[PDB]
Amino acid sequence: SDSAINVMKWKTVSTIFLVVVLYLIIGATVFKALEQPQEISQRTTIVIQREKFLRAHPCVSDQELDELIQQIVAAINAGIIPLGASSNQVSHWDLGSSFFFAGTVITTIGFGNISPRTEGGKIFCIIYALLGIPLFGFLLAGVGDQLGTIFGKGIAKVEDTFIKWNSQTKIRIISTIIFILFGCVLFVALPAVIFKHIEGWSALDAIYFVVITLTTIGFGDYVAGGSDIEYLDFYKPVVWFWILVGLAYFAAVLSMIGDWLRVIAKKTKEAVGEFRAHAAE
C-alpha cells in the first residue's frame, strides 16, 4: 500500500506544521514583549533629537532634513562614514573584505554588512552561491567527519577506563555530556572570551554572536572583524578556522537537539496515549 503510508505522512507533516505555526506565535509574542518597550522608548527619544534640531536651524528647509537623513541612510548601506574630521578611509571591498564576503556566501551565514551593489556582483553572487554553497557543504562534511573521528579517539580511551562493575546504553548518556561540555569550551566559550577582549563586546554580545554566526542565522548585528580597530592578523584567519570547525560542531549540536525533539515527541505522543487511556476513571 504505497498511498497508505503517504496518508500517514501528511498527518505527520500537517501536525508538525501547526507546531511550527504555534511556535512562531510563541516566539513572536515573546519578542514583541521583549522589544516593543525599547523600540518606543528609543522612538520617543529620537523625536527629541529631531525637534531639538528642527527649531535650532529653521533656516534649512526643514522638510529637506528627513530627505537628508534618508540620503545618509541609503549611503550607509554602501558603507560610508561621512564626516568633516575624517574623509580618507578604509575599504569595505578590499583584498580581504571581499574574501570575507565570499565566506559569508558559501557558508550561508550572509552577515550582509557587505552586500553587492553592482548588477554584475548580484549576478556573480547568485552563481557564486548556487555552486559555492554545495561545494562548501563537502568541506564542512569533511571537517565534520574529521572532527567526528577526532572525538571518537577521545571516547575510546574514556569508555574503557570507566568500565567498573556495572552498562552499554547508560555510558551513552555520559559520552554525550562530555561532547557538549568540551565542545562548548573550544567553540562557544573560548572564542567568546577572545571576541569580548578583542572586539570589546559584552559577555552576552560575544556568546550571542557565536550562536548567531555558527547556527548561520548571521544577522550581522555583530561581525567579528567588522570595525576598523587594529587587528593582530593572528586574529582574522583564526576566526575563519573557528567558523569552519564551529559550523561543523553546531551542525552536530543542532542535529542532536533534532534527535532529542524526536524522542520528546514520541514521549508526549505516548503520554497523550496514557492520558486518554485512564481519562477520569
Added chain:
Amino acid sequence: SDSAINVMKWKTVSTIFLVVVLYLIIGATVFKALEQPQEISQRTTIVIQREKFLRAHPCVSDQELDELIQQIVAAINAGSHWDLGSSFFFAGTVITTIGFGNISPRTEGGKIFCIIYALLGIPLFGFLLAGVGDQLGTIFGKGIAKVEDTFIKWNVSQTKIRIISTIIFILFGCVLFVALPAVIFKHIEGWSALDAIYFVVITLTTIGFGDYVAGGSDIEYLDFYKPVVWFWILVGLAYFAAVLSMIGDWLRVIAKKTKEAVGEFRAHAAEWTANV
C-alpha cells in the same frame, strides 16, 4: 592498519579544503573587481552631497553636521519594527536561518531568548521542511510517472531520459519558485527584474543578506501578500534544498571524473618516464 584509511580520508578533506580556499580567492577577486568601482564612485559622490550642504545651506555650521551624523548613526542601531507581524516574521528569520537581520534583538533578554529560540527552533523547522520536502518530493514523483511512460515507448530510450527528467524538474521548478514569485515581488515591492531574482536566490539559499526583504518597506500590504511569501519560503526552501543537493551531486561526479582523468594522466606519463 586503522590509520591507513584515515590517511585516505585527510587526503580527501585537505584536497577539498584547498579547492574551497582557492574558490574563496576566485570569488574574492571577482567581487573586489565588481565592487571596488561602485564603492569609490559612490564614496566620491557622497562628499559632493556633504560639501553641497555647506554651500546650499550655510545655515548649518560645519560643526553641527558631525553632531547630526552621530545622531543618525545612533538611530541606525535601533533600525513599528516589532509589531504583531514583524516579530512573527522575525521568528521566521530565526528558525529558517535566513536571518535577514533588518530586525535584530537589542534587549539583552531578546538576545538570550533568540539564542534559545534558535537552538530549539532550527532543528524543529528542519522537520517541517523535511516533511514539505517529502510531500513535494512525492508530488513531483506523480508528475514523472506520466512523463516516463509517454516518452518511453518510441524514441531514444532509458537512463539517458534521466537527463531529460531532471531538466523538467529544474525548468518547472524555477517556474513556481524563482520566476513566478520574482514577477510578483517586482510588481508588489517595485524592485527591478534582477533585484527580485537576486532576492529569491538570497532568501531561498538562506544566505539572506537582507539587502532585499519582501515586506520590509512601509508600503500598504494586501493581506493576501504576507502569508503567500511565508508559504513561498516554506516550499521554496524545500525546492532549493534539492537543487543545491543536485548541484552537490554534480560536483561529486565532476570530481570523480577529474580524479580518474588524473589517474590516466599519471598512468601513461609515469610509465613513459619509467622506461628511460
